[PDB]
């Protein structure tokens, strides 16, 4: 007896031809946007496009492939192990786009004046090809040799009928679980995602330390101007200018850079006039000249203090939007690597049951319906492309 075998399959397979029309719809939809608007033009999507071409996939090729090889149908066994392998490529094509996305920003954070000199729309054309060439080659390993196909699993292929070379194809009968938990997993996953952590956290920490600069030298300033103002002698002036006049030039390093040299222009003039007042023994005059300095500070040196915290606090902002994306392919495929380390590593253990393995399969394949929602709700440029065709080709 037991439950007719059809029952489970139908509410498996309407799961995943769901996740398909959604997969393929919001990855379409990110495509379109970057093609449309040029202020998405720029190489971190690039990396966006071929992450969203991967998905689209998913829902193209390997879901049609995970409901075939479900039915354990008779196959030619190099035939079988493409349809099973076929979506380790797309995985790992999705891998080497994330990690792409976090080398981008961490260099645009730390040699912001390097960036657009170092990382071209053309380099970054050709890292992506290299990339889908390394996914296949990795993704595709099982069929250079490292499989099962030597070994079938006879009382299978008789009860099934398969033919002369022909196995009933079954992921777990096909494909070696070594390979698929000391390479693909633990190699080909787990250390470039720690990789990514890794990156994600220098990523924080740089920004965090060019903010605290920004506020020591606004600080450093500030409190010199209020020693100048009580001081009584022109050394104690003379030793605050030379402080102030540090963190000046350290700030001006830290079209619209016209406006900001001009400001720091004035800033460190007087600066010099103030000093070299003092250097003469005039201490009132250097106090009276020091004072110039506060109407500078709030017509120049104020406001860009404010633009370049702000264009960091942007910067955060965008990386943990991008970083969230990175959890979330953790969250989706990790189950399924786990689940496989306990077939694996514990022949003791009971196989997790059947329903469970479907679950943690369908899980997988929901990662590639996310990504638009994330880009639509944390990244306002996205939003309001999304926004704009829908009411368009769609209104
Ligand atoms: C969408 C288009 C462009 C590409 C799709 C190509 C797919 C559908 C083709 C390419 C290789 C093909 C497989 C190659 C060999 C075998 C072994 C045979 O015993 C069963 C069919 C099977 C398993 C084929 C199924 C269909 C297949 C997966
Ligand atoms: C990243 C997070 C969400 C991972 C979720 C943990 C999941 C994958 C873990 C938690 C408990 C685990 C199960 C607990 C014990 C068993 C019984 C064993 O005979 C087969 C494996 C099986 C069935 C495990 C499969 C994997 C499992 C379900
Ligand atoms: C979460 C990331 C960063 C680390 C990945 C954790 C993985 C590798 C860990 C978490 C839980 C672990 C499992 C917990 C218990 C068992 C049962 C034991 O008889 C064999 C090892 C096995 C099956 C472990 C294998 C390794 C394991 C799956
Ligand atoms: C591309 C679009 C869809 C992918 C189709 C998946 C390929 C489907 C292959 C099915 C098959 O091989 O059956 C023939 C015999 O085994 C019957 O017993
Ligand atoms: C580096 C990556 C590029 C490597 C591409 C070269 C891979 C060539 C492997 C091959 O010819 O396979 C034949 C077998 O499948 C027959 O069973
Ligand atoms: C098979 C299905 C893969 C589908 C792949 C679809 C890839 C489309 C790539 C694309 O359209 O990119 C244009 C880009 O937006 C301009 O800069
Ligand atoms: C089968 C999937 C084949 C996917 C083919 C690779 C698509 C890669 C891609 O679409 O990249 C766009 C590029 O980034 C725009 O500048
Ligand atoms: C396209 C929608 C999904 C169609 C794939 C279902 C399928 O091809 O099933 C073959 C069957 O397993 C052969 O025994
Ligand atoms: C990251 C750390 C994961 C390290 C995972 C290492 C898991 C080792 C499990 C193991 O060695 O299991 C022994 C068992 O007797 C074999 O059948
Ligand atoms: C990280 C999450 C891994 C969580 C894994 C939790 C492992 C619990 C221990 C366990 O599952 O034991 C299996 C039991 O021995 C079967 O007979
Ligand atoms: C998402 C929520 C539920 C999806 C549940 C999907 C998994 C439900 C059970 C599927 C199952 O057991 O599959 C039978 C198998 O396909 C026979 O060949
Ligand atoms: N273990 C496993 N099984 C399957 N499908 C087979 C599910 C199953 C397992 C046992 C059985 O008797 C009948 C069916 N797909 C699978 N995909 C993956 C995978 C992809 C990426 C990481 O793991 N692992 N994996
Ligand atoms: C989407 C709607 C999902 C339907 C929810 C529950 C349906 C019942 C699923 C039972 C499948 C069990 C198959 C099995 O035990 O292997
Ligand atoms: C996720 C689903 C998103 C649905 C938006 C429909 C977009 C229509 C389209 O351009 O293909
Ligand atoms: C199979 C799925 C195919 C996915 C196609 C992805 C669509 C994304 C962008 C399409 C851009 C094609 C160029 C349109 C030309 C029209 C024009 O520019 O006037
Ligand atoms: C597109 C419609 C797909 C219809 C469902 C195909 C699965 C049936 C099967 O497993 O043979
Ligand atoms: C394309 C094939 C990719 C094969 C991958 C092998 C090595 C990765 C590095 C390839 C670099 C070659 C191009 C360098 C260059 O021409 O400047
Ligand atoms: C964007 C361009 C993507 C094109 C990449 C294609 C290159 C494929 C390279 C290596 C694939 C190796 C897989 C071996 C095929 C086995 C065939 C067989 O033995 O039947
Ligand atoms: C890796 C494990 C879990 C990843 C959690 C996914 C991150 C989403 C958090 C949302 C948020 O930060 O507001
Ligand atoms: C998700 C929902 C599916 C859960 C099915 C668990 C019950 C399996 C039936 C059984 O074999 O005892
Ligand atoms: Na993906």
Redesign the pocket.
């Given at each position: 007896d037991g439950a007719p075998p059809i029952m489970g399959s139908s509410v498996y397979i309407t799961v995943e031809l769901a996740i398909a029309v959604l997969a393929i719809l919001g990855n379409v939809l990110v495509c379109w946007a970057v093609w449309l608007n040029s202020n998405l033009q720029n190489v971190t999507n690039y990396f966006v496009v071929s992450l969203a071409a991967a998905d689209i996939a998913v829902g193209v090729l390997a879901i049609p492939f995970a409901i075939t090889i479900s039915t354990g149908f008779c196959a030619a066994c190099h035939g079988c192990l493409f349809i099973a392998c076929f979506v380790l490529v797309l995985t790992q094509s999705s891998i080497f786009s994330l990690l792409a996305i976090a080398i981008d920003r961490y260099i645009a954070i730390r040699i912001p004046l390097r960036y657009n000199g170092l990382v071209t729309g053309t380099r970054a054309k050709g890292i992506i090809a290299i990339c889908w060439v390394l996914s296949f080659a990795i993704g595709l390993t099982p069929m250079l040799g490292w499989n099962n196909c030597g070994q079938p699993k006879e009382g299978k292929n008789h009860s099934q009928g398969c033919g002369e070379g022909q196995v009933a194809c079954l992921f777990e009968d096909v494909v070696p679980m070594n390979y698929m938990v000391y390479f693909n997993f633990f190699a080909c996953v787990?250390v470039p995602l720690?990789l990514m952590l890794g990156v994600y956290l220098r990523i924080f920490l740089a920004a965090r330390r060019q903010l605290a600069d920004l506020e020591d030298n606004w600080e450093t300033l500030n409190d010199n101007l209020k020693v100048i103002e009580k001081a009584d002698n022109a050394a104690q002036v003379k030793d605050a200018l030379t402080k102030m006049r540090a963190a000046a030039l350290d700030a001006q390093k830290a079209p619209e850079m016209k406006d900001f040299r001009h400001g720091f222009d004035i800033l460190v003039g007087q600066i010099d006039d103030a000093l070299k007042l003092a250097n003469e023994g005039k201490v009132k005059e250097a106090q009276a000249a020091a004072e110039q300095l506060k109407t500078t500070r709030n017509a120049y040196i104020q406001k860009y203090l404010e633009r370049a915290r702000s264009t960091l606090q942007k910067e955060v902002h965008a990386a943990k939007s991008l970083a969230i994306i990175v959890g979330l392919f953790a969250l989706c495929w990790?189950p399924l690597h786990?689940i496989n380390?306990?077939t694996f590593?514990?022949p003791?253990?009971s196989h997790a049951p059947l329903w469970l393995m479907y679950l943690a399969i369908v899980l997988s394949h929901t990662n590639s319906v996310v990504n638009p929602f994330i880009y639509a709700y944390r990244i306002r440029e996205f939003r309001q492309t999304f926004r704009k065709i829908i009411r368009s080709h769609v209104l």
């Open positions: 787990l720690l990790l786990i380390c306990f590593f514990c003791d253990c």
